[PDB]
Amino acid sequence: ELLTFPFASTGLEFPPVYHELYQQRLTKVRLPYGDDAYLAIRYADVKTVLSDSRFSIVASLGQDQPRTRAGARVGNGLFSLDPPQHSRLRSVLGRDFTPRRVEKLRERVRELTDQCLDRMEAAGSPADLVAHLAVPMPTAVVCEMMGVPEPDHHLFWGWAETILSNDTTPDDLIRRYQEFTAYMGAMVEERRARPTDDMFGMLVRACDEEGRITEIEMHALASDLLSAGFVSTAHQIANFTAMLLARPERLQPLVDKPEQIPAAVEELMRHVPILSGFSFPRYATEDLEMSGVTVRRGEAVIPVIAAANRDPDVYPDAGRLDLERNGLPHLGFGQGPHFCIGAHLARVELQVVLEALTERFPDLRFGIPENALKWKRGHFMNGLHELPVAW
Ligand code: HEM
Numbered sequence: 210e211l212l213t214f215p216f217a218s219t220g221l222e223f224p225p226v227y228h229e230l231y232q233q234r235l236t237k238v239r240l241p242y243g244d245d246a247y248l249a250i251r252y253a254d255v256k257t258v259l260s261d262s263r264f265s266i267v268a269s270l271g272q273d274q275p276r277t278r279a280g281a282r283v284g285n286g287l288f289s290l291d292p293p294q295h296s297r298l299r300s301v302l303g304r305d306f307t308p309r310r311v312e313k314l315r316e317r318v319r320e321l322t323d324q325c326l327d328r329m330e331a332a333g334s335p336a337d338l339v340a341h342l343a344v345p346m347p348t349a350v351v352c353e354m355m356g357v358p359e360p361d362h363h364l365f366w367g368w369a370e371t372i373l374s375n376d377t378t379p380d381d382l383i384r385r386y387q388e389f390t391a392y393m394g395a396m397v398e399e400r401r402a403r404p405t406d407d408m409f410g411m412l413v414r415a416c417d418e419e420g421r422i423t424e425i426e427m428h429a430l431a432s433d434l435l436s437a438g439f440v441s442t443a444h445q446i447a448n449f450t451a452m453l454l455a456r457p458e459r460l461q462p463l464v465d466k467p468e469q470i471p472a473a474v475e476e477l478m479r480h481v482p483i484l485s486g487f488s489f490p491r492y493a494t495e496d497l498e499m500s501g502v503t504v505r506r507g508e509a510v511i512p513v514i515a516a517a518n519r520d521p522d523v524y525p526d527a528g529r530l531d532l533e534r535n536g537l538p539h540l541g542f543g544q545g546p547h548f549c550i551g552a553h554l555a556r557v558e559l560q561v562v563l564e565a566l567t568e569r570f571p572d573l574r575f576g577i578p579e580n581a582l583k584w585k586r587g588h589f590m591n592g593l594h595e596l597p598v599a600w
């Protein structure tokens with residue numbers, strides 16, 4: 210009878226069971242659905258799972274995917290492939306997410322952030338930072354980049370939520386797939402009759418003109434980016450803001466030393482356990498040793514990035530949020546092939562958010578007692594339903 214995973218925790222709590230597991234050999238756990246799997250929790254082990262070619266993201270041996278969602282996570286996009294096939298598909302998007310291209314979006318990200326905060330401030334204190342900023346701004350950034358109009362943003366929230374909900378059935382996934390395919394089918398036909406200088410338009414040229422990808426691959430890449438690209442940052446804006454507002458000095462360290470905002474963002478990326486459970490298991494493609502256990506060909510191992518980010522040998526006093534830490538590189542954006550393609554855009558968003566909040570609301574504080582905060586309970590991610598803030 211195996212340890213159950215995910216573990217018990219509420220909000221952004223890091224559960225004490227990890228402190229036990231760091232002093233144990235690799236541990237096998239049973240999941241809500243699918244096969245059992247080992248839990249990689251040491252920094253080095255999580256790095257290995259995510260970047261060593263002996264770990265495949267594909268269950269090519271009949272495995273039942275260890276998971277928290279009733280419907281297995283399957284499709285034709287970036288999370289369904291190993292290199293080189295993954296690398297060839299990702300290369301279609303690559304150039305648009307390099308630091309050199311994303312750094313160009315800083316001014317636009319701040320424009321949208323400013324518009325969000327004008328409306329927040331016009332709504333009056335105390336106001337919900339989730340509804341006024343965390344949700345709208347990242348949604349607008351990627352929906353604009355892709356070429357989706359503001360009228361339709363709500364459609365992509367719903368499609369993204371059913372992906373991320375652990376009570377989503379395979380039937381719900383079918384409904385989502387059909388609705389989404391219809392919508393992007395419309396978008397494709399629009400761009401075939403009238404090309405556009407946006408990212409979906411780039412994908413349509415890549416399918417039609419260059420023949421680099423197939424239609425289903427074009428849809429898959431768009432679906433990956435519109436599922437992953439704004440609910441993520443949405444959750445993290447509120448998580449980061451809540452983390453800061455819960456300390457005695459709140460925003461003041463960053464008001465006083467704006468130049469430290471990039472380091473703060475990285476420490477928060479390390480510290481915040483953003484995942485309720487985990488992402489994708491990997492499967493060993495040959496016998497190998499990990500934290501005292503022989504992982505056999507075919508067996509699943511889950512990379513627990515949150516645990517890696519509190520590895521007691523990599524990070525002294527790991528539970529402490531120390532905005533000056535500059536610890537060794539966290540795994541909050543993953544590692545290896547599937548390292549977050551949006552990593553620099555998320556850094557830009559989160560940095561700009563802290564710039565805008567410190568500059569405009571230096572005395573930002575919780576608008577309700579902290580004990581009343583409404584943390585989510587059944588989402589793939591940890592976060593807040595609401596974040597009332599006062600100034
Ligand atoms: C704070 C915000 C974000 C966090 C914490 C985050 C985290 C991650 C992590 C850890 C992975 C790797 C998971 C694994 O290997 O199992 C990943 C993958 C991915 N992320 Fe991000 N992400 C964020 C924002 C974004 C944004 C802004 C985008 C795009 C606009 C994005 C798009 C993607 C995509 C497409 C993948 C799959 C990449 C691949 O398999 O090649 N994410 N994300």
Ligand SMILES: CC[C@@H]1C[C@@H]2C[C@@H]3[C@H]4C/C=C\C(=O)NCC[C@H](O)[C@@H]5NC(=O)/C(=C(O)/C=C/[C@@H]4CC(=O)[C@H]3[C@@H]2[C@H]1C)C5=O
Nearest residue numbers: 281282283284285286288372432433436437441483488489
């Ligand atoms: C902030 C935390 C970041 C946020 C990103 C978003 C990532 C999720 C969404 C990513 C891609 C996606 O939804 N693409 C279209 C569907 C696909 O065809 C396919 N079908 C499926 O069902 C399946 C998923 O459920 C996929 C779920 C992904 C799980 C995961 O690791 C998340 C990441 C986290 C680590 C697929 O990938």
